[PDB]
C-alpha cells in the first residue's frame, strides 16, 4: 500500500484536479480516446465524435469527465479503504460496460500525462511516484474483482 506521506502527496496533487474537475476530466478522456480509439467504441454516446475538435466541443464529454474524476477522487480520499466504492465500479465495468483492464491502464497513463501537461514543472518526481502508486492500487483492486468474475 501507500505510506502516509505518499497518501498526503496523492491528495495534494488531487487538489490541483479539484480546481478544474471538468477541464481535467475532459483532457483525460480526450487523451484516452485519441491515443486509443478503440476505447471510444465502448461509448455509444461518444462514438459520433469523429475529430478531437468535436471531442473538445462536446459538453456531454466534459460532463462524463466530471463524473469519472469525481468517482476517482472519492476513491482516492479513502486512502486504500475503498472496497465499498470500488466494488460497484469493478462490477459495472466488467459486466455492463465490458472494459478490459488494459483500458484502465490506458486511462491511468492518461491522468499522469494530463497532470504534467496542465501543471508542467509543478508535478514533482515524488508526486508522480505517489499518484502512480494510487492509480495502480485502484487498477489492481479492480483486476482482483475482474478475476473473481472471470472477465477478460
Ligand atoms: C475505456 C472505457 C472505460 C474506462 C477506462 C473507464 C474508466 C473509468 C474510471 C477510471 C478512473 C472511473 C473512476 C470510471 C467511473 C465511471 N464510469 Mn467508466 N470509469 N464508464 C465507461 C467506460 C470506461 N470507464 C462506459 C462505456 C460507461 C457508461 C457510459 C454511459 O453511457 O453513461 C462508464 C460509466 C462510468 C460511471 C457511471 C456509473 C457506472 O456505470 O458505473 C462512472 C462513475
Curated annotation (Swiss-Prot):
Belongs to the globin family. This is Myoglobin. Residues 1-147 form the Globin domain. Nitrite binds at residue 64. The modification Phosphoserine is found at residue 3. The keyword Membrane does not apply. Heme b binds at residue 93. It comes from Equus caballus. GO terms for cellular component: sarcoplasm. It catalyses: Fe(III)-heme b-[protein] + nitric oxide + H2O = Fe(II)-heme b-[protein] + nitrite + 2 H(+); H2O2 + AH2 = A + 2 H2O. Its EC number is 1.7.-.-, 1.11.1.-. Keywords: Cytoplasm, Heme, Iron, Metal-binding, Muscle protein, Oxidoreductase, Oxygen transport, Phosphoprotein, Transport. Monomeric heme protein which primary function is to store oxygen and facilitate its diffusion within muscle tissues. Reversibly binds oxygen through a pentacoordinated heme iron and enables its timely and efficient release as needed during periods of heightened demand. Depending on the oxidative conditions of tissues and cells, and in addition to its ability to bind oxygen, it also has a nitrite reductase activity whereby it regulates the production of bioactive nitric oxide. SUPFAM superfamilies: Globin-like. Monomeric. One of its GO terms (biological process) is removal of superoxide radicals. It is an enzyme of class 1 (oxidoreductase). PANTHER family: MYOGLOBIN. O2 binds at residue 64. GO terms for molecular function: heme binding; metal ion binding; nitrite reductase activity; oxygen binding; oxygen carrier activity; peroxidase activity. It is found in: Cytoplasm, Sarcoplasm.
Amino acid at each position: 500500500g501507500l505510506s502516509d506521506g505518499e497518501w498526503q502527496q496523492v491528495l495534494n496533487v488531487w487538489g490541483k484536479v479539484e480546481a478544474d474537475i471538468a477541464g481535467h476530466g475532459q483532457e483525460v478522456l480526450i487523451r484516452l480516446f485519441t491515443g486509443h480509439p478503440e476505447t471510444l467504441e465502448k461509448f455509444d454516446k461518444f462514438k459520433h465524435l469523429k475529430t478531437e475538435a468535436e471531442m473538445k466541443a462536446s459538453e456531454d464529454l466534459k460532463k462524463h469527465g466530471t463524473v469519472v474524476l469525481t468517482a476517482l477522487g472519492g476513491i482516492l480520499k479513502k486512502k486504500g479503504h475503498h472496497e465499498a466504492e470500488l466494488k460497484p465500479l469493478a462490477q459495472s465495468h466488467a459486466t455492463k460496460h465490458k472494459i478490459p483492464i488494459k483500458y484502465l491502464e490506458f486511462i491511468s497513463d492518461a491522468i499522469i500525462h494530463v497532470l504534467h501537461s496542465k501543471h508542467p514543472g509543478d508535478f514533482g518526481a515524488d508526486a508522480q511516484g505517489a499518484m502512480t502508486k494510487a492509480l495502480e492500487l485502484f487498477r489492481n483492486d479492480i483486476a482482483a474483482k475482474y478475476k473473481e468474475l472471470g472477465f477478460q
